[model samples]
Target: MAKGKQIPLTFDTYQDASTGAQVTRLTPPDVTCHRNYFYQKCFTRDGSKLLFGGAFDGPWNYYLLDLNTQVATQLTEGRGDNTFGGFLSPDDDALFYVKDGRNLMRVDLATLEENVVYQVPAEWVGYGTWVANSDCTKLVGIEIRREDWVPLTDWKKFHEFYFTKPCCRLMRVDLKTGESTVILQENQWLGHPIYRPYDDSTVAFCHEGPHDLVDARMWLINEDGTNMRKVKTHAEGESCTHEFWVPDGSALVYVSYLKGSPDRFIYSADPETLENRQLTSMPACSHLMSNYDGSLMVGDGSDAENDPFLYVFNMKNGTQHRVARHDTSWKVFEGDRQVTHPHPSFTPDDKQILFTSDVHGKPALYLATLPESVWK
Candidate 1:
């Protein structure tokens, strides 16, 4: 699953046949891991540095690209174990990620200094998937008991036990002092403790597993562990998944599928009003994310014959355009193999889209820029 060299990628360009937009492949020869989603670690606040886990030598360690200089800098060294996800500290001076799969480390962006912020207590273990509040004061994550190890060795058995028991525990940690708290515990599985990007009050998570198998896939709670409830409970046979806070924290954009239908529709739920609105639909599109203001939405075709290798959906006119395409023979995507998804997210300026693919052999990163005509 790992094969590549430590070469920096040159920005390459192409013309989008559908909209005449210019697409840029930001990092070539870099096999990036699934660190959160397309929307999280790809770009820094000032748009000067872009974060990624390039598999140049080892188990896909972290790296940041000098957006201006186009120079890629390696951030971590030990082992990546598919470094689940990472984020730029709210202040943009540091990066927070799980190193060696369990040790949470903070890398000072300027000094290039790395320090382990929180070490996993030996008793608990799971993918160290994490997220933080707006100010980066508090971080959230989940873990299953170490006793839950045996079943996890076999992918199929691990999944079976995940649905059969509520073995996961939700945790909150203070970044400044290194104090951790067990926020919640239950028999069912839970994962993705994402705090709303703008507001530090609300955090969103999902009931783990395939969407169709889970009844209420999304849930929300206060940072202090109050008011825990299902975000939006779907109808009898419906499934809702792949949710992200609309950058400003007004609503959450997610994908929903009705029972027996081939279409996956995009919808946004207003946490304030408790109302749900359907945006658009496409078959086989797994993830959906947007620009800071929620004006532009983009996601992958997810091996869908009709969707673009990547796509752009204009909110104003309600039109979706194909942005790019490539081959998918490098890896067969499955449960924990999320590293291969197009997982596309827009650049801070909303003009360029960043994604990773194995089209050219090893999973490499690419960026596509939209043209002026598609801007407004």
Candidate 2:
């Protein structure tokens, strides 16, 4: 209803019949709700609270869920809030998000005080999620010129915009002063601008298109708009997507798929030396994320016929096991197809995996605890 509005716990717990993993449905089945993007931080450092988006009252808004109390508190109440584009601050004291795809906002977790962190110039529109540095003093994001705006309503249009090569700018915004600077700008479509963990001086971004069509998927640039280079040079017919930094900043991890092939592999590249290492071959995981040290990873299956299950991989031994059946229909729900994707990621403690699915009905957040017999 309003900010600070308290909603009774809607969580239900049960053991997944297929995998024997303890599962908790964090939101009610009546409303559509989902966690932030897998690479984004959703839980506090202590793992007591979580940030998620829901349309409980009406328009989509962000909510804070208390894991200990099983209570949900409304954090934002307004329209045009990019539900999945925000993340928790490193200090766990505030939540930052883009409002109306232009105004960068910060809402204090304790006081619920909202402020405009920065607003893009009138000529540019915010393109994607903004991420903070390790100390949470600054953020990095992408923006495109207003004149180059395109509505990406379907797969055809999505690819059209990418091929149009609209001019875009990678930007860094100071959280304290709201001063924004262009880190890099080019006539190529840019998205997913992320700061290197523990290193504010560097940021990584993708060309933002069909993975197989982009000339190069991954690129790195300095905060001062220098030292720009491609992170990896993929072979012909090699498709890479969903790149994220390991929590410790040791490497950048992503999945590579060969065109017209069923095989996909997980790989990591050094941030400095650019040495690429194949972690292991994996199933059809649409998205993947690692734990604190990149020793363990969780991925969501995308192949409905053969690999419609969530998987956990032990990078040390290259062994993996199914965690649960994430049979999301992957249909357009809540006005976004991404809502049905099970973007699996490890919890801060690495004890549970968090993801989203619409298997039971409306999209809702779910958590599967790692079985001690296997993880131990």
Best by lDDT: 2
What's the TM-score of every candidate structure? 0.89, 0.97
CA deviation > 4 Å runs, candidate 2:
303-306
Error of 1 at 30 (Å): 8.2
- Clashing residue pairs in all predictions, respectively, total 7, 0
Q: lDDT of each model, Cα atoms only?
A: 0.72, 0.87
Q: After superposition, how far is residue 105 of candidate 2 from its true place, in Å?
A: 0.7
Cα lDDT over the full model 1? 0.72
What is the Å distance of residue 189 in model 2 from its true position? 0.9
Residues 36-124, candidate 2: write the lDDT tens digits.
98888899999999999999879889999999998899999988888888899888988998888788889999999999989988988
TM-score, structure 1 vs. true: 0.89
